[PDB]
Amino acid sequence: GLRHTFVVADATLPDCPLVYASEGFYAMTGYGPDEVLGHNCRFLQGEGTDPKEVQKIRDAIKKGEACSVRLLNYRKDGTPFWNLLTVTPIKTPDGRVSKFVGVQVDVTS
Ligand SMILES: *[C@@]12=NC3=[C]C([C])=C([C])[C]=C3N([C][C]([O])[C]([O])[C]([O])[C]OP([O])([O])=O)C1=NC(=O)[N]C2=O
């Protein structure tokens, strides 16, 4: 259907580093795995990113809730694009969040 990208962040480490990304994610951002794995997703943010929206994801992750926000992101080459991002918490049977999964859609239309 729509062209989306998928990533997995590890919530067992304190700053939710990305541990897996689909091919589309590298193709869309221009970054390779050597610059994506082990890092927090926020490197895709830049000057025009709305901090009110960034705030919503920071809070949702801290509370372990799903969240869906519209962010201005930037490719490796500096060019911007509109990222419709949905984060989902993945809990273990004991309620603890283990991973956050993210679906990212380039909605620049
Ligand atoms: C990013 N995708 C993305 C995917 C997952 C699974 C998670 C947990 C986060 C993201 N982010 C945001 C970033 O990691 C961070 O959570 C937020 O910026 C809020 O906290 P900070 O520390 O920045 O205040 C994504 N951010 C993007 O800009 N683009 C994505 O694709």
UniProtKB/Swiss-Prot annotation:
Transmembrane segments: none annotated. Residues 1-64 form the PAS domain. Disulfide bonds: none annotated. The modification S-4a-FMN cysteine is found at residue 41. It is found in: Membrane. Residues 65-109 form the PAC domain. Protein kinase that acts as a blue light photoreceptor. Required for non-photochemical quenching (NPQ), a mechanism that converts and dissipates the harmful excess absorbed light energy into heat and protect the photosynthetic apparatus from photo-oxidative damage. Controls the energy-dependent chlorophyll fluorescence quenching (qE) activity of chlorophyll excited states by inducing the expression of the qE effector protein LHCSR3 in high light intensities. This is Phototropin. The gene is PHOT. The chain holds residues 17 to 125 of 749 of the full protein.
